[PDB]
């Protein structure tokens, strides 16, 4: 669920940098992006919320009307020329149980530096599950928030594929 | 394409909000709330979100830009997008 | 380097080749065939010193 | 494990079916709908939104990122179809009527344009080529051993 | 190497150089360097070769196979004399397959030979072709995967019974 | 035949009598001693036939499927050495007891001389089969693949047997080379009719024909390793074998009983293909790949041109092993994994680089790439049947486009995008599992070399 | 005033243009509620197997097996007979073949007819 | 170009047919019309092994530009002067063509003006 | 084979108008290129078709790799609308990339010319279907319009991209790579028409419109492309009409053809034959 004034803040995005890719001038398009803030200051205080709704739903409309049909996008955003050039390279960390021996000799202190995330990472499971036990509710949880860690030598519940997870340029 | 490091970051972000006409520079810290302290609308976070955006060149999603509400969240946020760590 | 390179990769390629070619693929039938050469008036023919006549007298045009 | 309880089965007749097949496929009642029942064997499979995997949240946390899918939701019928590699659905800044009728229109305009241009051809105002030699008829593999018809060019 | 008479060539003219230009050719120096570069040792290590083999001379034969009494000859049902004609019929159906590959292959060669001016030069091989491949397709053409002998005189009969009938119908106008 | 029959059978005791950690071993070496044998049965003479006795033969046509079969023994017992390596002493020696059978009963098929010695071998292959499906496989749905594949095959060889026998009563001999010299043409009545359907209806069912083919997805795919290798590789190719050998004495009714089966495999294998497109499970998707090449074999049999012999006797060997190599490749996927889901583990080149390699030459392979001998049977019978009717082009054009679509489908899906995240245990490819793929893939390029050694009796 | 957006199965109506994501009453927004409680307990359930450091394997997942199996061997259980399912087995079925076997014996009768006569020109056609 | 407009928005019996022209006699007019004459014969043609297009009435020019570029070589900007020659035979050929063009023209227009006054006078 | 290619020249040389990938532009002009090959072939001229395949190989090169010089120094960014104030930043990718545009567009005597203005006369005297023509031509201006486009937006005016500027064209490896391939989009038409042996009669004798005719609408391509850019830095607003929707969008054809024919033959593999 998005609240009313997560919508027109996604709107508001959403218009300026298609109005970018219609200007692609930097001056002009600073002309034009003052003028549609001036639209939406317009009505930044409008208390009836009943009208506030059908003032968004007709500038949506305006917006698909108006929107560019090829739109920049960051060459690393889902849909940017880059988004997922660099997913082949990612390797995650446990293909590295499997290594040789003769391998491993080759990094012996990144080795020895693993086995020391790996034993940390032993030792904290049972205090995480037992923090999510009895945190959550008896329905079970609700949303997908995490909580963190409440006390001294504790780790946050569920870290270890947040924190051990690839490099964005992992080669 | 250079390393970032979390100075710069934190150079550029403040670099950034130093030409932003509604901040004063010598009010701005990194832990400057952007509405608690320098008074901003949350228009005005969303263009600020724009220019750092566009300071390093890729999409913050309006889900988790929405939660960058002074420059250090800033910086952490790109920090961990980027994996830099010194 | 390029000198190490022309022999291994130019020379004992082309001898190789040309070895296969002259005592293997020439030695049969219409395994290589030329286009015959054109030959143009006023030629002479090597093989048989046969002398080609020229053309005739060109009704010189203006140029 | 999977059970044979945990496995689709037969289309759901009564309230108290519709109620166990939703729960079985981690599904809000309300929000579960079979296929119809007609002879197709669909049985108590839901019908999901025909939606391509292209049109969900390209930022939101998938336990499957390639395929946009959580672990344990219910899989559409024909996800094999809407994966990110075939069929797309996502909307459309033209509408899709419209597209038909322009992308049509072009192509059928060419094509009569095309038969127009082939029925008054382009060309210069010059008489035939001329070649020497009864038209070149013995180059061109004339028999030899029959005479043709004699083909004679004259100055202008 | 091969005979002249089943792989024919015309005589080969050449025309001499005869050069308007003081520049050098790069060709011509570039063919006296393939020759003390390449054609010269090459030829060295095959003339050695051919030493070795002159030390060591044997043959190797054409076969050759008697003529056996054919399909037409044998009595029905009769294997040992059907079987001894359709092998037979067999070997001469590949012979006559390497037939008409030998004058397809003078039909290229001359093809590339005459470059423009084929259409009028290769007359000859055009016909002969043409000819061979009649004589080929009357003979095998149509037998099916399964071919033989007998099938092939079956085809044989109907196409003389139809040239019988043509020509009663052909001398009676 | 005896110096190939004889050292099979001494396989037997040769399992049961070894050292109980030397099975694997010693049968396996010495299976592939008896492959490089078969070798001298490449003595063949551009007329006759290589004729050793009354009761087999060796030709153009059996050669090369007798050389693939010997071959495929060695890479079965490579193939099933690892997942049968908890099975008990007893019961790994029978399992591989039942494969040298099979072997057995199957060059003694390929040699046979008189139809009806072929009929007894042809079944016979069947009970080692069914032991080997129900015994061994995995899933509760063997029980039901084998019965399928058992009553499928026998529903249409009983009558084939009344057929055999009224033949050796009205000709006095099944003797393959008499048939050749004693064969009259078929006259058109409805009693020919049955008894073409009834010489041609036991091979359909094993090509398999589209229509009689739902024995094969089941069958192929319940049944191990070993299982799918022969029964894809070389089991389908009897029923390829006989109609070859059959056909001689059907003309000329051929011509028209040709026409319902054509259009079944000409439309069924566009059918196939597309269903190749939309299969979940690897192994299925697979075995109806096997289904759609397998009707342009039947199409080429049946319209009986020098040209479509040639392609369909390259055919039936470019498929054997590039079939059974993929049922390896998907296999080796299972072992790990333990689902033959394809959509389950993803961006498997990331995690196996050199068997995405594999994967990648079977599936060229499969989807004909020139030169392979893949393209060139495929291309023969396209030849031949374009001069059957023009109009065929179009049906093997699309059946073309969709076969390279499903043949990268599937190593898109499995070898690229991103691996799936909780899969953790793809450990490295083995030896065994290497060496299995390229014993596979380098004889089938080699063939590319010396192409005519599998283009049959017709060359 | 602008012209309104017209869905087609290929192309989906954008979220931003539907009229029921404006209107939010209580009751819908206690079933995304809902909703979010069975998300994340499925995701719970995951994470903590996905995150278990002593485990090695496949984590297996009950909605996938459920939909390869809906797509095949639940598929004839739930099979009816009936006028549907005929006339489409009928039409997709035997529909194809009839056509295909009218196109070839059609194509080959004529050809047949014109060799037999002479009239079809296979000058050098000696490959089949 | 203009031609075209008058066939096809105009009328199109006064103007000639490009796959059919010449439709008149040679001589319809020309009293004592000379062949043209033809320099190169065909053997010549033949051994120097032309394009069958290039045999038309300019072949001695080309033959003697193939030859001058096969005996300048390398120096691949010589010959200039015989290139010129064939390029300047080939467009008096092709002016010669234009004058078949435009004979074939006036001869339409000259038999409808007798149609037109060989009817006026009925 | 004409109109196939006059249709294919045309449309893809429409679609570069509009599209603001640099990669895409680049693509969309050699299929525009491969039309205008196809053109060849249909009036009967396959030796000037192999020549323009010979022309066509050095330029269009050399424009890939120009392109890939920018994408490399902007960090992955092929959005030209992301570029700008590039003409003095990377002088020597400026210069192929300058020499690349006018020898796709003809300029004379460089290796473009060579091939492309020599098909343009033959097409318009040959015996030849009036449309196909006329595509031809409008494609050869729009050849002009695209070109300017890359120009105007990746070179000139002012910087676009951010501000961490790491552009850098000083590699000896992209240098002589560019070079070599700059030199023969000079001479290499030239040279190659200079020494190959004459096949055919060329058609030297037209009306002097039918002969500056490439010249010309490529002039007028420059100048019309020129006015359209100079308007797009007027503080003025944008109103998309359908004609720059279809160009955009690549005449709908993939949107339509890519999601309705996958659509049909999937669903029916798995509803029809499958189940
Ligand atoms: C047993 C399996 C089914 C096939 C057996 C033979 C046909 C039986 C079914 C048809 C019986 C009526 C015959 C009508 C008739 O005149 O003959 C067919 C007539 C032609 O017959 P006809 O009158 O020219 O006679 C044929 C020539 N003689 C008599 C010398 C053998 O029409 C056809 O060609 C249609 C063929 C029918 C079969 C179509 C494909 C198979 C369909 C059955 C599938 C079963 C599952
Ligand atoms: C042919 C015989 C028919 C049967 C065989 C062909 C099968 C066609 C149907 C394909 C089946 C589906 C296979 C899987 C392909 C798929 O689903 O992927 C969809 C893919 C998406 O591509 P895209 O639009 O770029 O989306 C990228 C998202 N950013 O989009 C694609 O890549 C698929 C595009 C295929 C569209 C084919 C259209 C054919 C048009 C031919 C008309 C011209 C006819 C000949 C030339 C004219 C005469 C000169
Ligand atoms: C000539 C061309 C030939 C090519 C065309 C061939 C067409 C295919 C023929 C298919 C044959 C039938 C199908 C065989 C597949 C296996 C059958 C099966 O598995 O069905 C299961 C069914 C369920 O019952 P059940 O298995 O017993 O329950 C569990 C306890 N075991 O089991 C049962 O209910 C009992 C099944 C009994 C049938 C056994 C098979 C016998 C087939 C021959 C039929 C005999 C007909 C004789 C009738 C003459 C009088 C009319
Ligand atoms: C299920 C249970 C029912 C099983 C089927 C019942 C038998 C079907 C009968 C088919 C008719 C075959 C027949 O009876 O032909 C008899 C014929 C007798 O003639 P004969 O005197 O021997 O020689 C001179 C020719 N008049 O004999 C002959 O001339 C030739 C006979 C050849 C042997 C035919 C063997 C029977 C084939 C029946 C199955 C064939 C079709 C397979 C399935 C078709 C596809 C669905
Ligand atoms: C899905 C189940 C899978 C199992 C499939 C089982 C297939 C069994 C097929 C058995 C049919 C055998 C044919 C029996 C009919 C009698 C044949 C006969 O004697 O008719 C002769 C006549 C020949 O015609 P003609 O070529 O003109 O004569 C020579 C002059 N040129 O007859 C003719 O005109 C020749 C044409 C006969 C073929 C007709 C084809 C019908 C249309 C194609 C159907 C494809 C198969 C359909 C299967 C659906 C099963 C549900
Ligand atoms: C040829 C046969 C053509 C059949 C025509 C259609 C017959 C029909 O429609 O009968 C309907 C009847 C039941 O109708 P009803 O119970 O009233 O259902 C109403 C709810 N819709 O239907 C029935 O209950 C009887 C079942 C009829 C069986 C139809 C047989 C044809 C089915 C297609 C077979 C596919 C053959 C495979 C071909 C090989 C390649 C796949
Ligand atoms: C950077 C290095 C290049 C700098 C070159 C500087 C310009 C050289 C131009 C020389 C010149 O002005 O003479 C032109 C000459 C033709 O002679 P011209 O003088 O025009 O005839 C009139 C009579 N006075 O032109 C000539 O002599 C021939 C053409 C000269 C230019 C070519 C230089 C060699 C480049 C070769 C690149 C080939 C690349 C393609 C490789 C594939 C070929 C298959
Ligand atoms: C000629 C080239 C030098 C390029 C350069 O220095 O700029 C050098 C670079 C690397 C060399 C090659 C590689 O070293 C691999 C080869 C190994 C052998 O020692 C010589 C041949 C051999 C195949 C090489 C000879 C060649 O001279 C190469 C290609
Ligand atoms: C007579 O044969 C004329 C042949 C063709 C005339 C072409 C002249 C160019 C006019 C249209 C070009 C428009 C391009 C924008």
New binding site residues.
Partial sequence: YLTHQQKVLRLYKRALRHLESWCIHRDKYRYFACLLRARFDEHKNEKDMVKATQLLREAEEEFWHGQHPQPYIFPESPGGTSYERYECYKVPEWCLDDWHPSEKAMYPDYFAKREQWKKLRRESWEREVKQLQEETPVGGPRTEALPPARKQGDLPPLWWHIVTRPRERPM | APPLTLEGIKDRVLYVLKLYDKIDPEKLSVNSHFMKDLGLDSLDQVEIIMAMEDEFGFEIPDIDAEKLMCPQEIVDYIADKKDVYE | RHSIFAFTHVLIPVWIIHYYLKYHVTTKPYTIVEKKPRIFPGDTILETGEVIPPMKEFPDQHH | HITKDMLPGPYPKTPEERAAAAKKYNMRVEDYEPYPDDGTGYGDYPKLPDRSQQERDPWYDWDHPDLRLNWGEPMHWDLDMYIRNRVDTSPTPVNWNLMCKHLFGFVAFMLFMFWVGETYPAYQPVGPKQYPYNNLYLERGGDPNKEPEPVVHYEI | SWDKDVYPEPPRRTPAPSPQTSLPNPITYLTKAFDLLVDRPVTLVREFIERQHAKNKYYYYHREFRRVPDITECQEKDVLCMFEAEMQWRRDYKVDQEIVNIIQERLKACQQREGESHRQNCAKELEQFTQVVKAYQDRYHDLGAHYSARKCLAKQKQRMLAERKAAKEAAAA | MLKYIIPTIMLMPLTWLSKNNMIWVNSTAHSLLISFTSLLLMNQFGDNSLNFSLLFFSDSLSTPLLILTMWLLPLMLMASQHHLSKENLTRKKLFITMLISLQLFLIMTFTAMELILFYILFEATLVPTLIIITRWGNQTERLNAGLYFLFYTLAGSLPLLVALIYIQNTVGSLNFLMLQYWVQPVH?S?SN?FMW?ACMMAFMVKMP?Y??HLWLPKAHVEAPIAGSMVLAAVLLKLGGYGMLRITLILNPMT???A???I??SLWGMIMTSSICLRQTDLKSLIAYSSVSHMALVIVAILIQTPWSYMGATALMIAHGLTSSMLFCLANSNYERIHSRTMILARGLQTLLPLMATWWLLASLTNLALPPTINLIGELFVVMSTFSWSNITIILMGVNMVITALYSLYMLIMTQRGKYTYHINNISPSFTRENALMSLHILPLLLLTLNPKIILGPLY | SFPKYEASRLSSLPTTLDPAEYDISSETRKAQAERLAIRSRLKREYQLQYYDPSRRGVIEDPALVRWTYARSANIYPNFRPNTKTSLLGALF??GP??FW?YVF?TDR?RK?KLIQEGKLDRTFNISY | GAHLARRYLGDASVEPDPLRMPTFPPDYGFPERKEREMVATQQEMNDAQLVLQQRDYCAHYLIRFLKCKRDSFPNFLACKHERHDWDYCEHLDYVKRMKEFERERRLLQRKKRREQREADMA | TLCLGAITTLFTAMCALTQNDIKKIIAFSTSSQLGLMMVTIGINQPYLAFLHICTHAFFKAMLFMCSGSIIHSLNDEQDIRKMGGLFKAMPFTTTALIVGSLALTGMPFLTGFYSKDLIIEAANTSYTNAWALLMTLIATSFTAIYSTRIIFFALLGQPRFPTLVNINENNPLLINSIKRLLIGSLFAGYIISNNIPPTTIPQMTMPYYLKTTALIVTILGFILALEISNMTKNLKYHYPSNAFKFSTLLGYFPTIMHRLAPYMNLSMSQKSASS
């Fill in positions: 058109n409805w009719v359907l024909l229509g009689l011509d028209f009983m026409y319902p089966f259009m079944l | 079925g035997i073949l009839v076997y014996k009768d047949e």
